[PDB]
Amino acid sequence: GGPSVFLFPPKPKDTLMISRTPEVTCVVVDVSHEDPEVKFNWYVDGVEVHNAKTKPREEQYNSTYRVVSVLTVLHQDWLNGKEYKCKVSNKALPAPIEKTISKAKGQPREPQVYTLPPSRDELRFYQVSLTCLVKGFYPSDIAVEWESNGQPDIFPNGLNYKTTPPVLDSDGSFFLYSKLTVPYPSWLMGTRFSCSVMHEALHNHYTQKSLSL
Amino acid sequence: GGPSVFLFPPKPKDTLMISRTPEVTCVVVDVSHEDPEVKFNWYVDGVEVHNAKTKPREEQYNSTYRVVSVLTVLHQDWLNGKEYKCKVSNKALPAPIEKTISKAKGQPREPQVYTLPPSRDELRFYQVSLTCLVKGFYPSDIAVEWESNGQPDIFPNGLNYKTTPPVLDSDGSFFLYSKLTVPYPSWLMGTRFSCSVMHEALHNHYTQKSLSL
Ligand SMILES: *[C@@H]1O[C@H](CO)[C@@H](O[C@@H]2O[C@H](CO)[C@@H](O[C@@H]3O[C@H](CO[C@H]4O[C@H](CO)[C@@H](O)[C@H](O)[C@@H]4O[C@@H]4O[C@H](CO)[C@@H](O)[C@H](O)[C@H]4NC(C)=O)[C@@H](O)[C@H](O[C@H]4O[C@H](CO)[C@@H](O)[C@H](O)[C@@H]4O)[C@@H]3O)[C@H](O)[C@H]2NC(C)=O)[C@H](O)[C@H]1NC(C)=O
Ligand SMILES: *[C@@H]1O[C@H](CO)[C@@H](O[C@@H]2O[C@H](CO)[C@@H](O[C@@H]3O[C@H](CO[C@H]4O[C@H](CO)[C@@H](O)[C@H](O)[C@@H]4O)[C@@H](O)[C@H](O[C@H]4O[C@H](CO)[C@@H](O)[C@H](O)[C@@H]4O)[C@@H]3O)[C@H](O)[C@H]2NC(C)=O)[C@H](O)[C@H]1NC(C)=O
């Protein structure tokens, strides 16, 4: 064939925070040197739009260019299920490649957030684990972060945490876990930690759950 | 080209338990009706073997057969890093397709297992969540299960649990979480639950961590 197209959704956090701005990204790979001509046509539910923006092309070590087309979207357009289509055309293609992406369908469901202290057996070590359980949400688009009331003297570098991907639960909903690693002295001195979750189905798209000794 | 080949590693649990038998699986898709002839040649570190077994072909909705070749492997052969090669040949191919798979390289690291009781705020609900943290292991091949001392009268159907995929941690090791959902009355009556973890770097490839009220 010829070039390949891939269309990605906006960041879950971008569509949920008022401060941020979501965008859809249409990437084009496998584009030839002989015909590096690429065009884009964007359609929101079958209605063309021309506010998208194409970034400069870039060569890769595999001797192929890379074209990307970014389309900023309204917060509530995506959350209401509007479908976004990217139409790519180039000489190397017999017919243009059209791709579409939208939010997962299904009545959203609200997550429950639970913080669990570190296991008693983990204090033998110096780094202990604070856990945040987020369960029962749909769709799986979600954002998770940790906060502290600890000054930089205890945390000169920021907080160290990692979050699992969403896992389909036995009731059609999703769950995940996020682990925050902190020194034991910080846990013992009464530091207040906070698990923050952004999800469509939450009121104000946000909830925050605390954890401390 | 023609048909496509895919080679899969043995289940982590299969290579760790003596009772089970691990297998490398070499799948062939996109095989034509005009030429449904397939051959396999297996090599363990460049040494041919003839104990593999081919299962009957199966028709697909897209009108393509699918041929599978299964090779049982010795437990310690895989765990010691031996590379397994699958060579596929068919009329529709100009030259045979060879694929190889082996265990991830790197000094193995032993996991730590910690059980966390359900959050106090989750008792509002009837289904509560028991958590098992497994962290600090390498490679990411691991198997996790839950056990109970509860008869079938409390659990006529088995235990309900889901386990996350491994997540790369900030020290090059991996962690995961497994969630067991149980009715609150079972938690309150003293039922003893058990998180069982099978990993190469564990002594006897097995460890078990308990949890109860
Ligand atoms: C006619 O219909 C067929 C069936 O629908 C089509 O077959 C499919 O063909 C595609 C390629 O076009 C293959 O894609 C690959 O999938 C691999 C994963 O396969 C496992 O998981 C899927 C479900 O997720 C499952 O259906 C497979 O059968 C396979 O299951 C595994 O099976 C083994 C033993 O059989 C078992 O031990 C495992 O536990 C089990 N695992 C699971 C999760 O069930 C990928 O690994 C491949 O990835 C490659 O390519 C990626 C990018 O393309 C790259 O990132 C990767 O690194 C890697 O290189 C690849 O995506 C499907 O597997 C195959 N499905 C089946 C059932 O055969 C057929 O293509 C279609 N005809 C045509 C013309 O399209
Ligand atoms: C020249 O070199 C560049 C970089 O090495 C290659 O760019 C990649 O090309 C492959 C072509 O297959 C693309 O593969 C697709 O990747 C997607 C992942 O997107 C994430 O990752 C990229 C980079 O890591 C991020 O930029 C992006 O924001 C995302 O975070 C997958 O989603 C795709 O999977 C889907 O399609 C395949 C094929 O149908 C299915 O098998 C999957 O199941 C799934 O449906 C796919 O794997 C890759 O995206 C390209 N990266 C970038 C950054 O563009 C060029 O391909 C290479 N040139 C040639 C000719 O290959």
UniProtKB/Swiss-Prot annotation, chains A, B:
GO CC terms of this entry: blood microparticle; extracellular exosome; extracellular region; extracellular space; IgG immunoglobulin complex; immunoglobulin complex, circulating; plasma membrane
GO biological process: adaptive immune response; antibacterial humoral response; antibody-dependent cellular cytotoxicity; B cell receptor signaling pathway; complement activation, classical pathway; complement-dependent cytotoxicity
Occurrences of domain Ig-like (ranges): 3-102, 111-212
Effect recorded for residue 123 to M: In IMGT allele IGHG1*03
Domain of life according to the entry: Eukaryota
PTM characteristics: Glycosylation on Asn-62 is required for interaction with Fc receptors and ability to activate the complement pathway.
Annotated region described as CH2, given as residue ranges: 1-105
Sites where a glycan is attached: 62
Disorder this protein is connected to according to its UniProt record: Multiple myeloma: A malignant tumor of plasma cells usually arising in the bone marrow and characterized by diffuse involvement of the skeletal system, hyperglobulinemia, Bence-Jones proteinuria and anemia. Complications of multiple myeloma are bone pain, hypercalcemia, renal failure and spinal cord compression. The aberrant antibodies that are produced lead to impaired humoral immunity and patients have a high prevalence of infection. Amyloidosis may develop in some patients.
Known role: Constant region of immunoglobulin heavy chains. Immunoglobulins, also known as antibodies, are membrane-bound or secreted glycoproteins produced by B lymphocytes. In the recognition phase of humoral immunity, the membrane-bound immunoglobulins serve as receptors which, upon binding of a specific antigen, trigger the clonal expansion and differentiation of B lymphocytes into immunoglobulins-secreting plasma cells. Secreted immunoglobulins mediate the effector phase of humoral immunity, which results in the elimination of bound antigens.
The protein's assembly and partners: Immunoglobulins are composed of two identical heavy chains and two identical light chains; disulfide-linked. Interacts with FCGR1A; this interaction mediates IgG effector functions on monocytes. Interacts with FCGR2A and FCGR3A.
Protein name: Immunoglobulin heavy constant gamma 1
